[PDB]
């Protein structure tokens, strides 16, 4: 039927989850080299927490093909970092250091502008 689709790499979520955990391990081990190689001012703990935050925001996916593309993109991102195709500016773009904290409560948004 219309639910019978072509897979990317994983035929079901359990196969997809294995790839997620393999990608997470690769990122986890890369952070110490990245902090040293790019001479970042963040700690290894900060880098690894940022990695965990990025994986968590996609925890609600249940479509294996979507998970496949997330892993494919995550691996491209890792390769850019390991090969030093990125510069220090690209690595630090995950941390939004120059962006002021936008308000989140109703009142604070009400005082500043019109956006919800």
């Amino acid at each position: 039927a219309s639910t019978s689709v072509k897979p990317i790499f994983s035929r079901d979520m359990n196969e997809a989850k294995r790839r997620v955990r393999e990608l997470y391990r690769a990122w986890y081990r890369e952070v110490p080299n990245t902090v040293h190689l790019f001479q970042l001012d963040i700690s290894v703990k900060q880098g690894r927490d940022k990695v965990r935050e990025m994986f968590k925001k996609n925890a609600h996916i249940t479509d294996p093909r979507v998970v496949d593309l997330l892993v494919i993109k995550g691996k491209m991102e890792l390769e850019e970092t390991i090969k030093v195709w990125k510069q220090r500016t690209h690595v630090m773009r995950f941390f939004h250091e120059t962006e002021a904290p936008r308000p989140k409560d109703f009142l604070s948004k009400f005082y500043v502008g019109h956006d919800p």
């Binding site: 294995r18 955990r21 997470y24 391990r25 081990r29 968590k56």
Partner: protein
């Protein structure tokens, strides 16, 4: 020195205590990582990588998934290191 089920058990529990997310008091040699200690998937993955560095060998994901408490980690390490003691 030669390894022993008590030496392995000492190091496995030593690594786990250096893991900031584990309350060492609730920690026993049988506490389930999810049910007992309250950790989640990714925490378990990190714990396995700590054992890879502590015991210096690769634990593949297919094997790593079943290691859900300190005892099973000890059993896996003893099994792979052929320590029958």
């Amino acid at each position: 020195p030669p390894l022993t089920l008590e030496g392995i058990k000492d190091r496995v529990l030593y690594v786990l205590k250096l893991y900031d997310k584990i309350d060492p008091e609730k920690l026993s040699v049988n506490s389930h990582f999810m049910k007992d200690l309250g950790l989640d998937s990714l925490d378990q993955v990190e714990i396995i990588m700590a054992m890879e560095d502590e015991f210096g060998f690769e634990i593949p994901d297919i094997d790593a998934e079943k290691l859900m408490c300190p005892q099973e980690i000890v059993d896996y390490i003893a099994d792979k290191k052929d320590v029958y003691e």
